[PDB]
């Protein structure tokens, strides 16, 4: 996360770290959506241009974390994966359309002060809140700058959703309805973005109707990190919810 701040303790208790077993390293962010299911970006698990194709046994999830590198004894919980599900129409060849995946844990994780699931949006919450200018929050342990470096603890940044024509005009990539973009404009006097290593983590909004946090987006892509005139692109979770529900109903 570029131009963010340290998270408060328990500020993002749905935050998940995807951790490679060997070598031991950060792979991606992710989020907890129930006691058995974790949501992330497909490109965290499958990205052939970069020779990325992880299987279940390659990875661990670490839940309840704050420090990036520490083993947070008596706080974090480490879970093994039972199965990965990547969206069948994920488009890694062109534009990262439908950049979404689910991971089922081998055993349910116990909730605590530090471990708690985020809500997935309903149609009405999505319609109300996914509007230009409305701000969401992005969290992760990814790099602090595009070129360098890396944070001691989880980072947090609040960013406004951007008008779709501005998103489209910022890139040569074809933007789809399964994406939205967020970030400040050059003239706006504030900045911030996701970066490498933040992939797969959540873009959340706090509903003013029921005071619950909803995951509206997944950290997907950006041309660099925090570049003037570029924006971060997020998977539109609500638009892909029917698939989420089909997977959980069939395999949960």
């Amino acid at each position: 996360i570029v131009e963010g701040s340290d998270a408060e303790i328990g500020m993002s208790p749905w935050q998940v770290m995807l951790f490679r077993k060997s070598p031991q390293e950060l792979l991606c962010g992710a989020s907890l959506i129930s006691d058995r299911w974790v949501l992330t970006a497909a490109h965290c698990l499958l990205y052939p241009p970069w020779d990325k194709n992880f299987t279940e046994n390659d990875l661990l999830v670490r839940i309840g974390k704050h420090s990036r590198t520490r083993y947070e004894r008596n706080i974090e919980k480490i879970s093994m994966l039972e199965k990965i599900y990547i969206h069948p129409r994920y488009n890694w060849r062109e534009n990262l359309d439908r950049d979404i995946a689910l991971m089922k844990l081998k055993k349910p994780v116990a909730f605590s002060d530090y471990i708690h699931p985020v809500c997935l949006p309903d149609r009405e919450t999505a319609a109300s809140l996914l509007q230009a200018g409305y701000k969401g929050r992005v969290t992760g342990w990814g790099n602090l700058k595009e070129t360098w470096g890396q944070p001691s603890v989880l980072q947090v940044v609040n960013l406004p959703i951007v008008e779709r024509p501005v998103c489209k005009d910022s890139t040569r990539i074809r933007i789809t309805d399964n994406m939205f973009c967020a970030g400040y404009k050059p003239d706006e006097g504030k900045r911030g973005d996701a970066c490498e290593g933040d992939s797969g983590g959540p873009f959340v909004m706090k509903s003013p109707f029921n005071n619950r946090w909803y995951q509206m987006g997944i950290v997907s892509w950006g041309e660099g990190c925090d570049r003037d005139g570029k924006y971060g692109f997020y998977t539109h979770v609500f638009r892909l919810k029917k698939w989420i529900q089909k997977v959980i109903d069939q395999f949960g």
Partner: peptide
């Protein structure tokens, strides 16, 4: 750069 995690998780 990461602190070793307990061996139980790597089995």
């Amino acid at each position: 750069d990461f602190e070793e995690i307990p061996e139980e998780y790597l089995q």
